[PDB]
From a paper:
Peroxisome proliferator-activated receptors (PPARs), composed of the α/δ/γ subtypes, are ligand-activated nuclear receptors/transcription factors that sense endogenous fatty acids or therapeutic drugs to regulate lipid/glucose metabolism and oxidative stress. PPAR forms a multiprotein complex with a retinoid X receptor and corepressor complex in an unliganded/inactive state, and ligand binding induces the replacement of the corepressor complex with the coactivator complex to initiate the transcription of various genes, including the metabolic and antioxidant ones. All four coactivator peptides contain the consensus LXXLL motifs that interact with the activation function-2 (AF-2) helix 12 upon ligand activation, whereas the two corepressor peptides contain the consensus LXXXIXXXL motifs; we investigated their positions in the cocrystals. The same applied to the interaction of PPARγ-LBD and the SRC1 coactivator or the NCoR2 corepressor. These structural findings support the idea that the agonist-induced formation of the AF-2 helix 12 induces the dissociation of the corepressors and the association of the coactivators.
However, the structural information about the unliganded PPARα/δ/γ-LBDs–corepressor complexes is far from sufficient. Using our sophisticated cocrystallization techniques, we first aimed to obtain PPARα/δ/γ-LBDs–corepressor cocrystals in the absence or presence of ligands. After screening hundreds of cocrystallization buffer sets as we had done previously, the PPARα-LBD–NCoR2 cocrystal was finally obtained. As >80% of PPARα-LBDs in our routine preparation contained iFAs, the corepressor attachment likely dissociated the iFAs. Notably, the structures of the ligand-binding loci (dotted circles) were ambiguous when compared with the previously reported PPARα-LBD–GW6471 (PPARα antagonist)–NCoR2 cocrystals, whereas the other parts of PPARα-LBD were similar. In PPARα-LBD, the α-helical LXXLL motifs in the four coactivators were located near the AF-2 helix 12 that was formed upon ligand binding, whereas the IXXXL portion of the consensus LXXXIXXXL motif in the NCoR2 coactivator was located in a position that interfered with helix 12 if present. We also revealed the structures of the unliganded PPARα/γ-LBD–NCoR2 corepressor and PPARα-LBD–CBP/TRAP220/PGC1α (/SRC1;) coactivator cocrystals utilizing X-ray diffraction. The enhanced degree of structural flexibility of the amino-terminus of helix 3 and the carboxy-terminus of helix 11 to helix 12 of both unliganded PPARα/γ-LBDs was supported by two independent solution-phase amide hydrogen/deuterium exchange (HDX) analyses that revealed stabilization of the PPARγ-LBD AAs 279–287 (helix 3) and AAs 470–477 (helix 12) by rosiglitazone. However, our results suggest that any ligand can enter this large ligand-binding cavity through these flexible regions rather than the entrance identified in the agonist-bound PPARγ-LBD cocrystal structures.
Numbering used by the authors:
A (entry chain E): 684 to 697
B (entry chain A): 204 to 256, 280 to 447
């Protein structure tokens, strides 16, 4: 379920 | 070449806590203000009260991953896949850096919860952290520094056998470069432990099993 957390952090610099 | 340096820089840059700073805090040396010791129910209640008045841990690994050369070039779904299955292994790997035989540092090093207090809780809470103390005690016996740990964590994340990967070809070639760099760095940084790389390979498998055992024990809540 943490796929949501890691996908947000992947799109952090933008 | 220049891969071990850039991976070590991304580690020092993206991780607030490393083994150097953790060992400094654990040493109780260059500071007359030691971390708050959580060793009973009262002190635990004191610590829990200030916390209400981990996403950061996973975000730190995500920024560190996309800073590994080649990881940002992968497909987005593969970057999500590599991180979704390898984050817990990397967390428990680096968790050894803040652990000793008697406890562990918490809250960016501001607290220290003792090992005996954790295993004194009732079932099944006393079984959550003790398996990690067991791994960390034997993992810290390898005496890895942050330069080793940075390459070790990079090999945990960049592996081409994760379920559901698409561009498995590039991930396996990327792991080949990380593993080849880890093997050469190990013998240059720890030459008198010539079987250290096979030992680390077994630890990566122990982490996979420790994470699997962690998910089972988590679901009984």
């Amino acid at each position: 379920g943490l796929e949501a957390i890691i996908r947000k952090a992947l799109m952090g610099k933008y | 070449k220049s891969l071990a340096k850039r991976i070590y820089e991304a580690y020092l840059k993206n991780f607030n806590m490393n083994k150097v700073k953790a060992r400094v805090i654990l040493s109780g040396k260059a500071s007359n203000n030691p971390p708050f010791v959580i060793h009973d129910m009262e002190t635990l209640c004191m610590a829990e009260k200030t916390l209400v008045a981990s996403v950061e841990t996973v975000t730190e690994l995500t920024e560190f991953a996309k800073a590994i050369p080649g990881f940002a070039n992968l497909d987005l779904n593969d970057q999500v896949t590599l991180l979704k299955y390898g984050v817990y292994e990397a967390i428990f790997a680096m968790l050894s850096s803040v652990m000793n035989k008697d406890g562990m540092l918490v809250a960016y090093g501001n607290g220290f919860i003792t090992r005996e207090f954790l295993k004194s809780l009732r079932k099944p809470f006393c079984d959550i952290m003790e398996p990690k103390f067991d791994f960390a005690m034997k993992f810290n016996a390898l005496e890895l520094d942050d330069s080793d740990i940075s390459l070790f964590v990079a090999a945990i994340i960049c592996c081409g056998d994760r379920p559901g990967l698409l561009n498995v070809g590039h991930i396996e070639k990327m792991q080949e470069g990380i593993v080849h760099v880890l093997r050469l760095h190990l013998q240059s940084n720890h030459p008198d432990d010539i079987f250290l790389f096979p030992k680390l390979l077994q630890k990566m498998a122990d982490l996979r099993q420790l994470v699997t055992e962690h998910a089972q024990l988590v679901q009984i809540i």
